[PDB]
Design an enzyme around this catalytic site. Structure first.
Site, mmCIF file in Angstrom:
data_model
loop_
_atom_site.group_PDB
_atom_site.id
_atom_site.type_symbol
_atom_site.label_atom_id
_atom_site.label_comp_id
_atom_site.label_asym_id
_atom_site.label_seq_id
_atom_site.Cartn_x
_atom_site.Cartn_y
_atom_site.Cartn_z
ATOM 1 N N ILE A 1 0.848 -1.185 0.000
ATOM 2 C CA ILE A 1 0.000 0.000 0.000
ATOM 3 C C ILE A 1 0.889 1.242 0.000
ATOM 4 O O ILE A 1 2.045 1.211 0.428
ATOM 5 C CB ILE A 1 -0.967 0.013 1.207
ATOM 6 C CG1 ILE A 1 -1.806 -1.264 1.240
ATOM 7 C CG2 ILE A 1 -1.908 1.213 1.174
ATOM 8 C CD1 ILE A 1 -2.931 -1.209 2.246
ATOM 9 N N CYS A 2 0.328 2.345 -0.502
ATOM 10 C CA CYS A 2 0.993 3.642 -0.576
ATOM 11 C C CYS A 2 1.542 4.112 0.766
ATOM 12 O O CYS A 2 2.751 4.031 1.013
ATOM 13 C CB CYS A 2 0.021 4.697 -1.110
ATOM 14 S SG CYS A 2 -0.439 4.502 -2.845
ATOM 15 N N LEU A 3 0.653 4.619 1.623
ATOM 16 C CA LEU A 3 0.958 5.338 2.859
ATOM 17 C C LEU A 3 1.668 6.661 2.608
ATOM 18 O O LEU A 3 2.240 7.236 3.542
ATOM 19 C CB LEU A 3 1.786 4.501 3.840
ATOM 20 C CG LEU A 3 0.997 4.024 5.055
ATOM 21 C CD1 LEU A 3 -0.089 3.060 4.616
ATOM 22 C CD2 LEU A 3 1.910 3.382 6.074
ATOM 23 N N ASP A 4 1.639 7.166 1.379
ATOM 24 C CA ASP A 4 2.326 8.407 1.052
ATOM 25 C C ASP A 4 1.456 9.603 1.416
ATOM 26 O O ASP A 4 0.276 9.662 1.052
ATOM 27 C CB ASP A 4 2.688 8.438 -0.431
ATOM 28 C CG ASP A 4 3.948 7.656 -0.733
ATOM 29 O OD1 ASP A 4 5.046 8.244 -0.645
ATOM 30 O OD2 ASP A 4 3.841 6.453 -1.049
ATOM 31 N N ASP B 1 -4.072 7.495 -10.268
ATOM 32 C CA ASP B 1 -2.890 7.480 -9.416
ATOM 33 C C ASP B 1 -1.739 6.845 -10.218
ATOM 34 O O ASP B 1 -1.287 7.498 -11.168
ATOM 35 C CB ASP B 1 -3.258 6.813 -8.086
ATOM 36 C CG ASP B 1 -2.593 7.478 -6.897
ATOM 37 O OD1 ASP B 1 -2.783 8.698 -6.710
ATOM 38 O OD2 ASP B 1 -1.881 6.777 -6.148
#
Lengths: 149, 76, 384
Positions: free
Chosen positions: A85-88, A118
């Site tokens: 997953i991103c978490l950005d 995205d």
């Protein structure tokens, strides 16, 4: 022997006060890993499913963010081929003011509202804008196939 | 100890900074802002293919006088 | 009848940016590839398989060299160059920002003191975050080197408490020798602690937690002394001249790192959606954004104005909450529509030299020549 007080005290409040719709518990060998299960949110393509997530706290936590990955295979444009997953965070950085709770909540809302726009490098993003109506159902099919029992 | 480094963009443009090996990557982003109007949160910096992190210094990456960093304006 | 020349600038900019995206830069696709090849050349190792590594290095960057920038500052730069030309855009860059007054009245007043029918205006905004120190370092005075200490931290010494800022100034936070004594020995042997761990700050168990909380209180008490603003977001507003008695309209143009491009902004028509609230309401919400101490209100407006369209309820929730205050600054210039449309038309001529019947064909024509140019350059520099 030694593991930071923040992890210890946060792990306490995570089992004592869990968030609606999510199960999260420490692995018994390494307490930095977390076995997570999120119930597919109501009135979503993933309704009824139960998805298993590995959350890992690196040595530098909570100065560094945790890393999260889907163990249950899932059809969703924001998920890696390996489940990651991103978490950005946009125009900000992970600080120790943000918790695992906020991470788990964001992944919970990410299921409730996929964002195809995205990275387009994977096909699942292409089908999630081209024929979105037909991406809802193939995600319903993958929910039955891999997120039941 | 003002040395000179360069910052190139995908458009071919070169920018000339006055820095010291002591200064953080965040400091040079702020110098890019002074010349280009680009806010620090709107830019990343690369050196020899390696993404530079904000807290570390130019010496931490062995960046020296006349080195060329690359301005990255999409998120990888 | 026809629209004003000033409005024609908006229509041309938006419709061209919608259709041609990365080409609006005006840089030859050959130069793009040669530039990316310069950035990718070290990731290649001569000892390895050359072409296989080239194709991999191409495939990994081929679709980013080839889409337009996400940087809010660069998009503002691009807008400014098209509407002002190179020389006047550089002049604009060196005129200084002014802070938005508490109710937005200073920007509201300047807009009102201009005739809507007479003038065309470009406003460029910059929004800063507050980036306060987030860790506490306990040293002994003998281990404290003020020249070389890491900046943007609070330092507890035996008999002193310093905030070191980003420019290397050491601000005495106030406490005397006895209070510093109490705090210094309340804490313990770890080098660094967090100033923002909610488990430390809201569940104080040890004397060390109570001491870190008291240091946070001392700092927050003096915040107005310091400057930890850091530039975050950039956008522009174009206000074209009116015809006759028609009302004035404003159009916000932006991109957003890690989110979207100017092309995405225009295709989503969010510039038009925001335009419908009117410039007076926009300024008000911009003033509330900088005035508010309420995290939910700050996050709501920031998302309403600056989110990719559709993500308003999601752009500023959870990990993306606006938990620090914000500062809104601006600067103003008039544009000459004749120069602006000229600049757009030159870009149109550059686009038209690219083969293709439709705009999609010309874009794809551009993107592919960039992929080819990158590979061909890399081969040359490795002497193959």
């Amino acid at each position: 022997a030694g593991l930071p007080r923040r992890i210890i005290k946060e792990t306490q409040r995570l089992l004592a006060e869990p968030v609606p719709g999510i199960k999260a518990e420490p692995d018994e060998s390494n307490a930095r890993y977390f076995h997570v299960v999120i119930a597919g949110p109501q009135d979503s393509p993933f309704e009824g499913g139960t998805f298993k997530l590995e959350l890992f706290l690196p040595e530098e936590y909570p100065m560094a963010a945790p890393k999260v990955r889907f163990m249950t295979k899932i059809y969703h444009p924001n998920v890696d081929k390996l489940g990651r997953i991103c978490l950005d965070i946009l125009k900000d950085a992970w600080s120790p003011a943000l918790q695992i709770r906020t991470v788990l909540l964001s992944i919970q809302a990410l299921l409730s509202a996929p964002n195809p726009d995205d990275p387009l490098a994977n096909d699942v993003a292409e089908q999630w804008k081209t024929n979105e109506a037909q991406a809802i159902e193939t995600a319903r099919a993958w929910t039955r196939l891999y997120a039941m029992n | 100890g003002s040395m000179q480094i360069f910052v190139k963009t995908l458009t071919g443009k070169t920018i000339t900074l006055e820095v010291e090996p002591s200064d953080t990557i965040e400091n040079v982003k702020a110098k890019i802002q002074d010349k280009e109007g680009i806010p620090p949160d709107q830019q990343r910096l690369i050196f020899a293919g390696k993404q530079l992190e904000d807290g570390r210094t130019l010496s931490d990456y062995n960046i020296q006088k006349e080195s060329t960093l690359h301005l990255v304006l999409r998120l990888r | 009848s026809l629209e004003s020349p000033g409005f024609m600038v908006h229509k041309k900019l938006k419709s061209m940016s919608q259709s041609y995206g990365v080409m609006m830069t005006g840089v030859p696709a050959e130069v793009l590839g040669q530039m990316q090849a310069e950035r990718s050349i070290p990731s290649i190792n001569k000892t390895g398989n050359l072409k296989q590594q080239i194709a991999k290095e191409v495939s990994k960057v081929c679709h980013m060299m080839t889409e337009p920038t996400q940087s809010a500052g660069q998009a503002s730069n691009d807008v400014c160059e098209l509407l002002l030309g190179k020389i006047e855009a550089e002049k604009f860059h060196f005129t200084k920002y002014e802070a938005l007054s508490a109710d937005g009245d200073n920007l509201k007043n300047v807009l009102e003191n201009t005739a809507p029918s007479s003038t065309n205006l470009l406003i460029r905004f910059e929004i800063d975050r507050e980036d306060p120190p987030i860790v506490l370092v306990k040293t002994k005075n003998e281990n404290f080197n003020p020249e070389t200490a890491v900046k943007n931290k609070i330092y507890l010494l035996e008999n002193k408490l310093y905030f070191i800022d980003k420019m290397g100034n050491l601000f005495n936070l106030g406490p005397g020798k006895k209070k510093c004594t109490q705090l210094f020995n309340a804490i313990g042997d770890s080098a660094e602690y967090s100033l923002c761990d909610p488990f430390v700050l809201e569940e104080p168990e040890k004397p060390e937690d109570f001491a870190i909380s008291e240091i946070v209180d001392i700092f927050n008490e003096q915040k107005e002394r310091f400057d930890f603003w850091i530039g975050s977001h950039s956008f522009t507003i174009y206000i074209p001249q009116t015809l006759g008695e028609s009302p004035r309209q404003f159009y916000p143009y932006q991109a957003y790192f890690g989110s979207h491009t100017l092309q995405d902004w225009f295709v989503s028509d969010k510039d038009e959606y925001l335009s419908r609230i009117g410039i007076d309401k926009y300024i008000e919400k911009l003033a509330v954004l900088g005035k508010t101490t309420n995290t939910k209100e700050r996050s709501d407006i920031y998302a309403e104005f600056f989110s990719k369209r559709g993500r308003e309820a999601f752009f500023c929730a959870h990990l993306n909450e606006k938990r620090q205050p914000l500062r809104v600054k601006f600067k103003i210039t008039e544009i000459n529509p004749e120069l602006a449309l000229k600049n757009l038309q030159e870009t149109q001529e550059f686009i038209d030299t690219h083969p293709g019947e439709n705009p999609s064909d010309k874009v794809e024509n551009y993107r592919n020549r960039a992929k080819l140019a990158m590979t061909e350059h890399l081969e040359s520099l490795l002497d193959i």
